[PDB]
Structure formats: C-alpha cells, structure tokens
Amino acid sequence: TDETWQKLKEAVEAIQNSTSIKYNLEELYQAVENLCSYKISANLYKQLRQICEDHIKAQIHQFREDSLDSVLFLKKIDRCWQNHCRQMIMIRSIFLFLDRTYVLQNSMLPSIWDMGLELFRAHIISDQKVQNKTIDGILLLIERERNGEAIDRSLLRSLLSMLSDLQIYQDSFEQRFLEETNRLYAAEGQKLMQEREVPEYLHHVNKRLEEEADRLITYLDQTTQKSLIATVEKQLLGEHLTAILQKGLNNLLDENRIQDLSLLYQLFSRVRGGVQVLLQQWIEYIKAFGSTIVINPEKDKTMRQELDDFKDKVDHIIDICFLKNEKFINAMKEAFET
C-alpha cells in the first residue's frame, strides 16, 4: 500500500496546483489497477474523494474578499469552475479503471465526475453568501443589458451553464430571474404606456420580445423559454390590451396606418384574449364611424360612394393587416346590418 497511493496522491495534487505530473502515465494507470485488484485496507475512492474535498474546501476563501467588484467576483467564480472541471476531467482520465469498474460492478457510489460536482456544490456554491453574491451579479448583468449596457454574454452563458450542470439553475436563478423580469417589464409597461403613443409603443414591445428571445438563444437555458416569453407578453401586452385600443386604435384606423395595424395584429396574436378583445373594438369602431356618417356626412361626395369608399378602406385592412381573417369579415357584415 501507501507507496503506490503516494504516486497518485502526488499526481492529483500536481493537477490541483497546475504543476507537473512527475511520472509517466502508464505508471499511474498501473497504480490505479493495482489498488483495485488487491484490496488491502483500500477503498481508493474514499481517499480520492478526500484529497478532492480538501482542495475544493480551500477554494472558498477567494470569494470572501470584502467590497469586490461584482463582475470580478463572477469572473473568479467562473475561473474557479473552469479549473475544477479541467482538474476533475484529468483525474477521471487517470482513474478511468476505477469508475468504469464501479459501473461494471454496479456501484451505488457517484461517478468521479459527479463526486466532483457534489463537492463543488457543497463547499462553494452552496455557501449562502457565495451563491447570493453570484446570483446578484448574474441578475445585475441582465438588468444592465436590458437597460442598454454592454455585458459579457459568454460569461453569463458559462455561469448559467454551471448552475445547470450543478442542477440548481431552477432553484437559484430561474425563480429570481422571472421575479425580476416580472417586476421590470411590469414597470416598463406602465411607464411607456403613458409616455409614448401606441405606434411607438407597439414597436417597442416587438423590440423587447426579440431581445428577450435573443437572451434565450444566447446565454439562458432553453427551459426558460415558456415562462420568460409569457412574462414579457403579459406585462407589455396582456396588462394593456384594452388600454392600447382606447388610446390608439381609433387614430390608427381613421388615418389608415397599415403597417402599425399589421403589427397590432401580430402582437395581439401572442396573448390569450387578444385577437378577441381587438375584434370587440373593431365592431365598436364600425358602428361608431358608420352610425355617424349616416348622421353627419363629410359633404364631399354623395352617400353611396362615401359608404363604398369606407368598405374599400376596411377590406384592404382585413386583407393585409388581419391576414384574410374571416371572423373580422363576419363581424363587419354583422355591424353593417345594424
């Protein structure tokens, strides 16, 4: 015993400190095979677990530096992670006989890689103060980006990917991310719904949905797709559908703003109750415009054509903006027979 294990113990420590492995690899692979085939005191797995636990427990101190820049802190977490993975991958190569035997022998012990993930989770990211300053920084970069500032997307992707590999993406990040996304776009909805007209507002909503779709593609996990887009759709559209029509639909129809009307249909198509709520106000607009042209004619042309000019105007809008939608044609016929 002892002697042989010191070979591997020194090789592991060289890997951990990024120094030199002072043996030819065949000697180290042989060492692993010997300790597994003649069990003495043994259990080489428990000893390897120990020297991995010691080294990783020593990595906690760098994240306790008081008043350290958030981005710099995130970069230390990432570097710590990239080093841990690289070291664990190499240890796994040397000890391939061990965990392939424990799988061949149907062991209940975690693989060497998972054992490293468990230790990394336990002693680094599990630390409440460490995880909190980690998540705060990740959310703060997303907030900076939504506010127009440039951030390292690769850094975000690497850290969030880490949280997924450690199986805490949902617990640690996704919950708080949606909560902050919810509060942010809720406020942005109320604020820009007052400051900007509907045409400038609709363009902005479409711009955010593409941006949030971009953050999903770029650095977020794919399972966040459903909850994130629904959140943005709710806070920028669902909470304001009725308010948007009462503020802009009349002006958009009276001055025949086809492009803005096409976009209104596309954005309202994204939300439940949206195309329907528009259809209600489409009816109210026809009854209002029509029932006032039989009361007050814009005495330029006769009444038959001014009514024929109106149907042409509206048919062009159904054809292009509302995508040949029958339900809008039927609603128009019903209104005319009023």
Binding site: G290, V294, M303, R304, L307, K311, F336, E337
Partner: peptide, 13 residues
C-alpha cells in the same frame, strides 16, 4: 333621411 340609403347598401352588399 340617410337611414334609407344605408339599409339599401346593406342589402346590396
């Protein structure tokens, strides 16, 4: 007197 021409158009259309 316009509630006449409208209903005519509504039947024709």
């Amino acid at each position: 007197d316009r509630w006449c021409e409208l209903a005519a158009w509504t039947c024709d259309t």
